[PDB]
Amino acid sequence: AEAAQSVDQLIKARGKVYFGVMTDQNRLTTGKNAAIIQADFGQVTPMNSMKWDATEPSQGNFNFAGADYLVNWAQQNGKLIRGHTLVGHFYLPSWVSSITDKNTLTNVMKNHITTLMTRYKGKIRAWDVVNEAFNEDGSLRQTVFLNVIGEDYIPIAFQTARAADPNAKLYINDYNLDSASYPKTQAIVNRVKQWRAAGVPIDGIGSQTHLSAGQGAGVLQALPLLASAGTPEVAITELNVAGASPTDYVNVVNACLNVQSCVGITVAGVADPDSWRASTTPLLFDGNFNPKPAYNAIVQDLQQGS
């Protein structure tokens, strides 16, 4: 019956690539996460296991236990993987952020990128190569990478990534790209246009979409603005909405459908209590692992638009 269709099965029926979720071994081996992900979602992103602190706690000495679990679980369950994330300022060991030499940090950054993407070469649909690189005002965020390498670190990260695995779609990912009139949204479009004009292989813009209630409507204009940068893809990468209103969620799903370059949507987790903001109950399954009204609203709208 119609009532029984998945959001992933339906978004695929409408011409999209996936409707996925952020997860990791800890979730996958508890509660009903794995069963829900197998049945309802086509794509997974490692919540933590592929970040720098997790994978390179000391220079050159990599740890892949968690990441390998996620990648193999995904492969044996037919789920696409978005690798996440290579270069960014949170989850960065202080051994990295300590480096003050340009050529040392450059080499360190390139080794980190190449190591990770070489290990999973060919198995990763898309990588968030650079995360959270813009300030709110639209200027580039003054991280250790920006301050020590300079703004060339972004082109360098993407060229390096393309060399390590030319099969993966290479993304830049950010939050607060949800309003078309917001400086951050306009800036990332402008910079990504310029970088791509100079042959930087930015295949995608990822918009995390951590929404407050009522912010769904504006995504309808923010998302096509993001796609006007001319990347082959855009994605919604960490979707969750404080209060989980059906309107907010359906607006975001509709923005995706409206944007030919939008390949899919990944929500920030499965069940509310596992949210970074659990008390705003922002996800699509509740504390009993039951689908919420927003989940039904999405399925229904996906069918109705067919």
For 1-306, CATH number out of 3.90.650.10, 3.40.50.300, 3.20.20.100, 3.20.20.80 equals 3.20.20.80
Q: Are 266 and 22 in contact (CB under 8 A)?
A: yes
Task: Single out the residue of 212, 257, 205 nearest to residue 233, CA to CA.
Answer: 205
Cis link prior to 85 (omega < 30° from 0)? yes
The structure tokens listed for 128 are: 């968030």
- Pairing status of strand 126-131 against strand 169-174: parallel
Helix axes 216-227, 183-197, angle to 10 degrees: 20
∠ Cα 7 20 75 (to 5°) = 120
**Region label for 20, one of left (φ > 0), alpha (ψ between -120 and 50) or beta (otherwise):** beta
**CB burial class (10 A; 0-12, 13-18, 19+) of residue 30?**
exposed
For residue 66, give every residue at least 6 positions away whose Cβ sits within 8 Å of its Cβ, in sequence order, or none.
24, 25, 46, 48, 49, 50, 54
**Nearby residues of 146 by Cβ (< 8 Å), 6 or more positions away:** 133, 140, 153
| Strand pairing class (80-87; 126-131) | parallel
d(CA 161, CA 146): 18
The token pair at 79 is 């789920």
d(CA 9, CA 269) in angstroms, rounded, equals 18
Instruction: Report the candidate in 136, 176, 129 with the shortest Cα–Cα distance to residue 154.
Output: 129
Give the phi and the psi of residue 228 in degrees, each rounded to 5. Answer: -70, -10
Specify burial of residue 169 (Cβ count, 10 A radius: 0-12, 13-18, 19+). Answer: buried
CA 74 distance to own-chain centroid: 16
Active-site residue list:
132, 238
CA distances from 233 to 97, 155, 168 (A): 31, 18, 12
Q: Which of 140, 136, 207 is nearest to 173 (CA)?
A: 207
Query: Structure resolution in Å?
Result: 2.0
User: What's the rounded Cα separation, in Å, for the pair 280 and 77?
Assistant: 31
Residue positions counted in the chain: 306
**Rounded distance between C-alpha atoms, residue 46 and residue 143, angstroms:** 23
Give the chain as a 3 state SS string.
Answer: CHHHCCHHHHHHHCCCCEEEEEECHHHHCCCCHHHHHHHHCCEEEECCCCCHHHHCCECCECCCHHHHHHHHHHHHCCCEEEEEEEECCCCCCHHHHCCCCHHHHHHHHHHHHHHHHHHCCCCCCEEEEEECCECCCCCECCCHHHHHHCCCHHHHHHHHHHHHCCCCEEEEEECCCCCCCCHHHHHHHHHHHHHHHCCCCCCEEEECCEECCCCHHHHHHHHHHHHCCCCCEEEEEEEEECCCCHHHHHHHHHHHHHCCCEEEEEECCCEHHHCCCHHHCCCCECCCCCECHHHHHHHHHHHHCC
The CA distance from 219 to 206, in Å, is: 13
Are the C-beta atoms of residues 306 and 294 closer than 8 Å to each other? no
Closest CA to 195 of 167, 166, 162, 221: 162
* Cα 35 from Cα 23, distance rounded (Å): 13
Alpha-carbon distance of 242 to 74, in angstroms, equals 28
Alpha-carbon Rg of the chain, whole angstroms? 18
CA-CA-CA-CA dihedral for 35, 306, 203, 219, to nearest 10: -90
Give the span between the Cα atoms of 188 and 186, in whole angstroms.
6
β-strand partners of 240: 210
Way it was determined: X-ray
The distance between the two most distant Cα atoms of the chain, rounded to a whole number of Å, is: 61
139 and 57 in contact (C-beta within 8 Å)?
Answer: no
Cα angle value 148/149/152 (rounded, 5°): 150
